[PDB]
């Protein structure tokens, strides 16, 4: 079915800084990917973003009860909803699972691939580092970057090109759920 | 750590499919959506619905307004349609693979629009629907979409798996392959 499609999107956005001390509410309206009109609480009224949005900006801005509702959204909507879910969103902290293992596909000569798999953590901010018998490894380090699993957990895979011999490699993970670096050592 | 947090109430309506969506998004993860057909709030994690509540009726009214607004935006644009943007597909597991230890294949479908996609899991070329699940379309800051499909499975060197993705923006159906060694 190759019928032409037409998509409308609306994003009501609440941006928070330092908890609920600073809040920005945005009321954004889209035709396909094109944002055409926007209410920014820092501006105080609707403003067209493209030519397609001139009618809406004028029409909604001429309704005082409408602007007065959107101008209180930072309190009645953003700050309220932040408090509703704060305990299981802002304060959600799940430990990373750190596993170290040689890659099941060893693709290069002389060097082998060592994998530090970090799984199931939340929130997404994480720092993964490789050490070789006490020396930080910045060469031969490959990482997937942060991967969102879509279920409120994240994972990342950080691979090291090792010189396989006897030597001790440490994966060190730092994450907001931890009060100390998490280290896993691999001796070949 | 993270000084900024964003809660997004994201909505869309798509013609002529008459498909709508309403969901809450925190820092890129879904808190809940409203099932259009069932008029029910569906929490992404069931625990969320034990701590918070939401009246689905208001969300459905929003969707109807978005439908009305859409028909006006469509005429206003002289019936300009959406450009198909094909997805990029990645297949991975939720944890490191181990023989006969339950795992989950994740099919990550990213950066696409319109929000309509046909996904099918294949085990050895045969479709598999046992225990599959999926998310709604998640919003992106380029205002494309993202989607996850999941397949619980028992890893073995015997089996190979594919995520078959069909989208209007693609030329051939997209097949992302996964084996034990991937």
């Amino acid at each position: 079915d190759t019928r032409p499609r037409f998509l409308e999107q609306v994003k009501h956005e609440c941006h928070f800084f330092n908890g609920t001390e600073r809040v920005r509410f945005l009321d954004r309206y889209f035709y396909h990917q094109e944002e055409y009109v926007r209410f920014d609480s820092d501006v105080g009224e609707y403003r067209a973003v493209t030519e397609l949005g001139r009618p809406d900006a004028e029409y909604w801005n001429s309704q005082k009860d409408l602007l007065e509702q959107k101008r209180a959204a930072v309190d009645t909507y953003c700050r309220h909803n932040y408090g509703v879910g704060e305990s299981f969103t802002v304060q959600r902290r799940v430990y990373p699972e750190v596993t170290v293992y040689p890659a099941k596909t060893q693709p290069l000569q002389h060097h082998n691939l060592l994998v530090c798999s970090v799984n199931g953590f939340y929130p997404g901010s994480i720092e993964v580092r490789w050490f070789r018998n006490g020396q930080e490894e910045k060469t031969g380090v490959v990482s997937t970057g942060l991967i969102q699993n879509g279920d409120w957990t994240f994972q990342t895979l950080v691979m090291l090109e090792t010189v396989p011999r006897s030597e001790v490699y440490t994966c060190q993970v730092e994450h907001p759920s931890l009060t100390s670096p998490l280290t896993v050592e691999w001796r070949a | 750590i993270k000084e900024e947090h964003v809660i997004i109430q994201a909505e869309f309506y798509l013609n002529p499919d008459q498909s709508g969506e309403f969901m809450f998004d925190f820092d890129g993860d879904e808190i809940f959506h409203v099932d259009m057909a069932k008029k029910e709030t569906v929490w992404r994690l069931e625990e969320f619905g034990r701590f918070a509540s939401f009246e689905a009726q208001g969300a459905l009214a929003n969707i109807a307004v978005d439908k009305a607004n859409l028909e006006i935006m469509t005429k206003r644009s002289n019936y300009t349609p959406i450009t198909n943007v094909p997805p990029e597909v990645t297949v991975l597991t939720n944890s490191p693979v181990e023989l006969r230890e339950p795992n989950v294949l994740i099919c990550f479908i990213d950066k696409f629009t319109p929000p309509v996609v046909n996904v099918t899991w294949l085990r050895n070329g045969k479709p598999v629907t046992t225990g599959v699940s999926e998310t709604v379309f998640l919003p992106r800051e380029d205002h494309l979409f993202r989607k996850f499909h999941y397949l619980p499975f028992l890893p073995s060197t015997e089996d190979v798996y594919d995520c078959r993705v069909e989208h209007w923006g693609l030329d051939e159906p997209l097949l992302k392959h996964w084996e034990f060694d991937t």
Binding site: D27, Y77, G83 | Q9, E11, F32, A52, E55, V65, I72
Partner: peptide
């Protein structure tokens, strides 16, 4: 507690 909805405005 209850989540609040923000209204999508009809044009």
């Amino acid at each position: 507690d209850r989540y609040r909805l923000n209204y999508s405005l009809p044009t």
